[PDB]
Amino acid sequence: MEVIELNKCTSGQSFEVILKPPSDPSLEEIQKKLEAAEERRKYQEAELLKHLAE
Amino acid sequence: MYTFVVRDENSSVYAEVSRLLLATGQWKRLRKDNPRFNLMLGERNRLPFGRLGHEPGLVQLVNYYRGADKLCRKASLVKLIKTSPELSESCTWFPESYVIYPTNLTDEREVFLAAYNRRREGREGNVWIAKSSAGAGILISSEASELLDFIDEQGQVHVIQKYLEKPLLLEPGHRKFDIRSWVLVDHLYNIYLYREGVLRTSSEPYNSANFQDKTCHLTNHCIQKEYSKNYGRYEEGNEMFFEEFNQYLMDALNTTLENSILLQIKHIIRSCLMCIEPAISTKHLHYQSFQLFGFDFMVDEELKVWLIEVNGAPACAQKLYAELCQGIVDVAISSVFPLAPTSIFIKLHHHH
Amino acid sequence: MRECISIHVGQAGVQIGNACWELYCLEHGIQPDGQMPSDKTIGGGDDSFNTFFSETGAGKHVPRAVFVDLEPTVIDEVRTGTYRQLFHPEQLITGKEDAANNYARGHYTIGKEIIDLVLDRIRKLADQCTGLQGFLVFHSFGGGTGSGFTSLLMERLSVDYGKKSKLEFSIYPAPQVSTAVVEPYNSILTTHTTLEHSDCAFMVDNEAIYDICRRNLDIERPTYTNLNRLISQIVSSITASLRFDGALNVDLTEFQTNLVPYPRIHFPLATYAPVISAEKAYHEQLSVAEITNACFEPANQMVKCDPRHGKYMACCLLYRGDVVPKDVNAAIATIKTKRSIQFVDWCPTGFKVGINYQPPTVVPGGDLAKVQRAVCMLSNTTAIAEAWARLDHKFDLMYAKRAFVHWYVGEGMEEGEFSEAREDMAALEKDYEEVGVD
Amino acid sequence: MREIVHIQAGQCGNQIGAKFWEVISDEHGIDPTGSYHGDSDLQLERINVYYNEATGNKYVPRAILVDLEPGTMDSVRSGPFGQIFRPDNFVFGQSGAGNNWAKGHYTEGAELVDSVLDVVRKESESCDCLQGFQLTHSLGGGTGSGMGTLLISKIREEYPDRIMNTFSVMPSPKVSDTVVEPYNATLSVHQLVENTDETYCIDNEALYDICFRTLKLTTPTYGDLNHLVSATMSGVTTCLRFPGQLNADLRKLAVNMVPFPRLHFFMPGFAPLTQQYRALTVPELTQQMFDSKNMMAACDPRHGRYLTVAAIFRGRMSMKEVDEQMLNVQNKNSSYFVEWIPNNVKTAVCDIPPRGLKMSATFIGNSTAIQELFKRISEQFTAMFRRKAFLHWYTGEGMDEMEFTEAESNMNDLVSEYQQYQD
Numbered sequence A: 001m002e003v004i005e006l007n008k009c010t011s012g013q014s015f016e017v018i019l020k021p022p023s024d025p026s027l028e029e030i031q032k033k034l035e036a037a038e039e040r041r042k043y044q045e046a047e048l049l050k051h052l053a054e
Numbered sequence B: 001m002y003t004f005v006v007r008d009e010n011s012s013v014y015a016e017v018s019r020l021l022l023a024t025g026q027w028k029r030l031r032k033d034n035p036r037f038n039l040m041l042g043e044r045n046r047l048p049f050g051r052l053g054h055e056p057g058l059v060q061l062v063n064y065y066r067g068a069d070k071l072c073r074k075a076s077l078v079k080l081i082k083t084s085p086e087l088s089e090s091c092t093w094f095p096e097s098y099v100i101y102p103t104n105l106t107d108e109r110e111v112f113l114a115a116y117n118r119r120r121e122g123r124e125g126n127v128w129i130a131k132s133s134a135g136a137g138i139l140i141s142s143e144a145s146e147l148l149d150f151i152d153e154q155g156q157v158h159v160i161q162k163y164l165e166k167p168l169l170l171e172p173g174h175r176k177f178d179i180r181s182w183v184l185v186d187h188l189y190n191i192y193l194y195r196e197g198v199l200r201t202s203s204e205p206y207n208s209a210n211f212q213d214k215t216c217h218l219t220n221h222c223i224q225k226e227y228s229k230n231y232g233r234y235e236e237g238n239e240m241f242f243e244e245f246n247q248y249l250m251d252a253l254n255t256t257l258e259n260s261i262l263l264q265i266k267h268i269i270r271s272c273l274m275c276i277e278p279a280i281s282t283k284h285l286h287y288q289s290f291q292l293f294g295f296d297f298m299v300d301e302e303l304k305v306w307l308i309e310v311n312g313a314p315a316c317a318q319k320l321y322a323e324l325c326q327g328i329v330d331v332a333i334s335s336v337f338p339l340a341p342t343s344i345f346i347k348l349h350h351h352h
Numbered sequence C: 001m002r003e004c005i006s007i008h009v010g011q012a013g014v015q016i017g018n019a020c021w022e023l024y025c026l027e028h029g030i031q032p033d034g035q036m037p038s039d040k041t042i043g044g045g046d047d048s049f050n051t052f053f054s055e056t057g058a059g060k061h062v063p064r065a066v067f068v069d070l071e072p073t074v075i076d077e078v079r080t081g082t083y084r085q086l087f088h089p090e091q092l093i094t095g096k097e098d099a100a101n102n103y104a105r106g107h108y109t110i111g112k113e114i115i116d117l118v119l120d121r122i123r124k125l126a127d128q129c130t131g132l133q134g135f136l137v138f139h140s141f142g143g144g145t146g147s148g149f150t151s152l153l154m155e156r157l158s159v160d161y162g163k164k165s166k167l168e169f170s171i172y173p174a175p176q177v178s179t180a181v182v183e184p185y186n187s188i189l190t191t192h193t194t195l196e197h198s199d200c201a202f203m204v205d206n207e208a209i210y211d212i213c214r215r216n217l218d219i220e221r222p223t224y225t226n227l228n229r230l231i232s233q234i235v236s237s238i239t240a241s242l243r244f245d246g247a248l249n250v251d252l253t254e255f256q257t258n259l260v261p262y263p264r265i266h267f268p269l270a271t272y273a274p275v276i277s278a279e280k281a282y283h284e285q286l287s288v289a290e291i292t293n294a295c296f297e298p299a300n301q302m303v304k305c306d307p308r309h310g311k312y313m314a315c316c317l318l319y320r321g322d323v324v325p326k327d328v329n330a331a332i333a334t335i336k337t338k339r340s341i342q343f344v345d346w347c348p349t350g351f352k353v354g355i356n357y358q359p360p361t362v363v364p365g366g367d368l369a370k371v372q373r374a375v376c377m378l379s380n381t382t383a384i385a386e387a388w389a390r391l392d393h394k395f396d397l398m399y400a401k402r403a404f405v406h407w408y409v410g411e412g413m414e415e416g417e418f419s420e421a422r423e424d425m426a427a428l429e430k431d432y433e434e435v436g437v438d
Numbered sequence D: 001m002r003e004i005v006h007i008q009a010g011q012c013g014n015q016i017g018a019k020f021w022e023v024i025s026d027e028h029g030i031d032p033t034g035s036y037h038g039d040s041d042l043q044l045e046r047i048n049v050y051y052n053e054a055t056g057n058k059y060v061p062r063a064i065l066v067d068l069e070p071g072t073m074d075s076v077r078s079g080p081f082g083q084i085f086r087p088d089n090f091v092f093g094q095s096g097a098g099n100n101w102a103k104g105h106y107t108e109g110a111e112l113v114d115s116v117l118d119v120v121r122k123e124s125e126s127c128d129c130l131q132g133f134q135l136t137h138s139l140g141g142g143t144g145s146g147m148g149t150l151l152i153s154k155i156r157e158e159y160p161d162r163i164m165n166t167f168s169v170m171p172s173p174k175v176s177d178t179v180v181e182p183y184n185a186t187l188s189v190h191q192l193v194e195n196t197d198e199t200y201c202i203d204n205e206a207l208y209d210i211c212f213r214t215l216k217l218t219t220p221t222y223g224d225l226n227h228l229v230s231a232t233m234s235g236v237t238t239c240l241r242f243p244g245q246l247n248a249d250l251r252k253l254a255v256n257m258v259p260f261p262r263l264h265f266f267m268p269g270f271a272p273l274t275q276q277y278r279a280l281t282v283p284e285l286t287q288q289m290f291d292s293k294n295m296m297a298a299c300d301p302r303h304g305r306y307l308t309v310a311a312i313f314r315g316r317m318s319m320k321e322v323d324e325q326m327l328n329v330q331n332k333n334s335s336y337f338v339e340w341i342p343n344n345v346k347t348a349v350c351d352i353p354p355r356g357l358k359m360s361a362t363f364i365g366n367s368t369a370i371q372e373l374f375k376r377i378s379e380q381f382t383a384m385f386r387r388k389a390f391l392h393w394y395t396g397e398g399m400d401e402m403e404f405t406e407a408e409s410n411m412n413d414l415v416s417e418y419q420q421y422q423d
């Protein structure tokens, strides 16, 4: 039951009690993902229009 | 109309409780995966406790206490007793036990040998028994060499504890036995001891000069009905109930079952369950638990009672399924979900 | 001094952010017009509160905050609300139609068209900082914007501010206050893509906030305002160290250092006490021991789970009010002899304690009673994995039938991203089990 | 500003559509001349969803009235709120469609559809942010059925990413005008399966039974049936017309109701349906709302399972007691809710009740029991088609038998799709 690193100031204090010792994707890659999904949306809409044209 | 799901088809106890619940015409059984249940008769292993109590508007109850395995595992029970101040290492009603991991894997090997060498030197009885939860796999020997080598041949944790060389032997027969007590703990953590117990007796005369034949040393109902040639001779199914056992203690030892044995059993049950109550209590939890326990005791020739193990998913004696299963519904289920005596239990009062 | 930029995404994030900055102002003595009389340095200063507030020459104190929502009705509340004067228009970003509870729609379809704008507005705030620490990102799991656009924002932030910390305050979905069936889908999709980009995430389960409001505040049917005022008290407790003088959790990096030994396991459990109803005749004031002991009761945890059956990796006690270290150590000693507190063997069994003498501030006319002392415990338990299991299970039930999947595929997301995200959660569940179970 | 463009096509579509605007105009305080005379700001909060604002603070419905004969739309223009509609929004011909899907869809309708889309475009161009469209029509006639589904197809082509929503009256031999109604309904259903996001199935048989058995009307009329549709349309759109959170947007509603794209056909229900002054308790609202006798698709829900349910409660009541009763119905009958969609029952509350009611509840169910409705249609269709009976009315308009065979297959596929998820 030890207390360590007691820090005190006018607005409070902080300390530590020990009870027992122990025993990314680049900007380019993000644009591709975003554009790939947009391309799949476009391909799906084109197929819808192609179906409606028929 | 209350709803319940079944997730252990192999439970004879709750198969009857489920059969009773439906008979009341006020309980409905849902598919085992339907989450909108009031009551779960859960599986033995890996019961998904973390999914209980998150259904808006449903008070949910389960027939197992999360964490009670600490008491119902051979190795866990030993560790719990030795490390818990409430039970202490000097606990007088539990045989001297040690947790021994096979060498192919803390471990109490050296601690066990030290106490063993002491007994060997002091001319004392030095017979130990080795067992584990992964058994149907038991060995009784007076040589430490055989006990340790038998565990290495296996691959799971084991426990070596002192074998009760001076057991109480029923007469006629000169035969060993153990006492099974059923204990139901409800959601409020009341401890109810079923008034009916069973003595699972050995139909063979006890023989201390031959631990090789384990039919007169192991009182398991399966071993007696498979390897014992006098099965069913003295009592039906090697099962003596309290009425007969109490009468015997009166005719033979001029004492009563309550005075000589039952007080110790009730004391042991209380101690064990009160010890783990802070860890498994569901008092302030989002769901509620109850559980049926099977306590196993040994009685020595001094009328001292010893705890053998605790079973978390016990079966019952055929003759006592109706009474007990009804009692489970009365105090465990209907207390939380009431329906539109002379209790069969014995409430062991205690401080929460 | 180092600045912190708060980002509020979606309805949940924006309305929670509205409640926090309301509380922040009351705590620092800032009026709705931005004026702060106690600030004797007009138009500047590197005080602790300046980590969250910038200053104009006219003495206004402006939150370092950005509000983003793909639909304008929620942010229009800020523009005309009590604190409309705090923020300037550049800080409030709104689109015209939302993501419809569809992660793919917030992340891909709509996110792709507004991401650069949001980053530009954030860049403006960052340019006012002499030493930016990082970001605090508030959002929900279930919303299409909260889930879908946040993950896109977190990825870009890691690219534009590689060395900056990012903390999350995430709203875990609760059916009692949710009307979207697909929120398990969104929660898991956004956890997967955000996992490697967030240094520390504080999950708040609406089910827990809801029950605390009904149980302790006697609110029969709590509203978002009830839920959000309670949530901003916890957020305030967690961020007070950045806004006030102190030595514990004084910068964003210290949250990871103190609470997250393993990067993926960065979801501390938050526990708060006491929550007292203001409508009470008058409440007996709780002691340091009582409010500390309450930190180990499930009923006051931000996520319903059972820490008794997990393992702790770290533990911070954040006290506010009349609290001296003497009483703290006394309460802790008593709680160890009674509570089931198991730490992982590779971590010390201890507590980092922080005390701020200013007791909790409560919004006038709110639901919370003024108390003389309160505490918020931040503990990293494996028990919080229960919340992942509940969520992953609901995901599996629907995904086995591909229910609602067509909505996500229709927005340009591949079906494989579902299973990819699910397998990542399966790995997250395995990591918790390896750390907490024997 | 999430505007919806309303379209009503054909006789049934225009008569039911008319009553709809009469009902909701009252709820929002709009008088027959479009002047607002309400007393609650909640009325105007979302008024722009269905109304445009003209000079002088006039509110003009965003509705397009379509028909191939003038008769029914003259009745509207002469009806109670006839003057409230934009005069330019009346688009009609003189030929009629003779209860003939082919005439509405391929011949007579095709000649008129372009002028309808001109008005649709005009309304959409003035929308700040168009949500989508809602169409009221019947499937048993020629204009609403044939031209209506032609309109959806051409609207989808021009607004592919908006939500298409319909209130579709299904024919029944008990309330029948012509024997070809099964033909027209089967042809339309295939269109709807493809080109609508949400279709409220309104069965004239259910409406009849409710008027006869529950409402005790000795001789029900189309007017009586339409009173139930008006009340139902007002209930299901409450989430759109007042402030809310659950399904408060067409696309958000679709996201939570439609787990599979082709299974988007809903069973609506209303309560009360009435001792008419007695107060109605929250339990009674819930019991009735879920009662089959209160539903308008003539399908027994106990014959299938609910994929998703949306409930709306209107009036000043105990929201706590609402959650309790809703949770009581789910927990007391969870065998009728698929277990593989957690929390598929969502409840919303609105404080403004309908005219002349302390409180009410509207029910919206995506149930697999709806397959019973398509089975009835399919059976009647096949009974005639196997003998090619009455086919000449259709082949005389350029159609081939192959098109009927394909419509048949498509609806039987739909029924099979409902069956697999019911198991």
Ligand SMILES: Nc1nc2c(ncn2[C@@H]2O[C@H](COP(=O)(O)OP(=O)(O)OP(=O)(O)O)[C@@H](O)[C@H]2O)c(=O)[nH]1
Residues within 6 Å of the ligand: C009, C010, C011, C012, C013, C015, C016, C069, C070, C098, C099, C100, C101, C102, C106, C140, C141, C142, C143, C144, C145, C146, C147, C171, C172, C173, C174, C177, C178, C179, C180, C183, C206, C209, C224, C227, C228, C231
């Ligand atoms: N605690 C709390 N939860 C909220 C609040 N607002 C929404 N939620 C929760 O957030 C989830 C829905 O996500 P939203 O934030 O509303 O959706 P969104 O981020 O605006 O994204 P959209 O789909 O575009 O609307 C549900 O689980 C709600 O319970 C709030 O103000 N406070």
Ligand SMILES: Nc1ncnc2c1ncn2[C@@H]1O[C@H](COP(=O)(O)OP(=O)(O)CP(=O)(O)O)[C@@H](O)[C@H]1O
Residues within 6 Å of the ligand: B095, B129, B131, B135, B136, B161, B162, B163, B164, B165, B176, B177, B178, B217, B218, B219, B220, B296, B298, B308, B309, B311
């Ligand atoms: N220390 C000991 N001394 C004497 N006998 C012992 C003993 N430990 C075990 N036994 C004997 O072993 C039998 C059962 O052992 P144990 O209970 O450990 O195995 P088990 O768990 O498979 C049977 P159950 O679970 O039904 O009680 C008892 O009947 C008892 O007679």
Ligand SMILES: Nc1nc2c(ncn2[C@@H]2O[C@H](COP(=O)(O)OP(=O)(O)O)[C@@H](O)[C@H]2O)c(=O)[nH]1
Residues within 6 Å of the ligand: D009, D010, D011, D012, D013, D015, D016, D097, D098, D099, D100, D138, D139, D140, D141, D142, D143, D144, D145, D169, D170, D171, D172, D175, D176, D177, D181, D204, D207, D222, D223, D225, D226, D229
């Ligand atoms: N509920 C209701 N159904 C109607 C009404 N008018 C016609 N119907 C039904 O609609 C079908 C006839 O379609 P109708 O609208 O008259 O043909 P259309 O004008 O060519 O579209 C038949 O099934 C009728 O039972 C009405 O006012 N109310």
Ligand SMILES: CN[C@@H](C)c1ccc(F)cc1
Residues within 6 Å of the ligand: D174, D175, D176, D177, D208, D220, D221, D222, D225
């Ligand atoms: C179909 N014939 C007309 C007269 C009719 C209308 C409504 C109704 F409920 C019953 C009959």
Ligand SMILES: [Ca+2]
Residues within 6 Å of the ligand: C039, C040, C041, C042, C043, C044, C045, C046, C047, C055
């Ligand atoms: Ca200053």
Ligand SMILES: [Ca+2]
Residues within 6 Å of the ligand: A024, C158, C162, C196, C197
């Ligand atoms: Ca990073």
Ligand SMILES: [Ca+2]
Residues within 6 Å of the ligand: D111
């Ligand atoms: Ca012509």
Ligand SMILES: [Mg+2]
Residues within 6 Å of the ligand: B309, B311
């Ligand atoms: Mg056993």
Ligand SMILES: [Mg+2]
Residues within 6 Å of the ligand: C010, C011, C071, C098, C143, C145
């Ligand atoms: Mg939103």
Ligand SMILES: [Mg+2]
Residues within 6 Å of the ligand: D011, D012, D141, D177
């Ligand atoms: Mg007609």
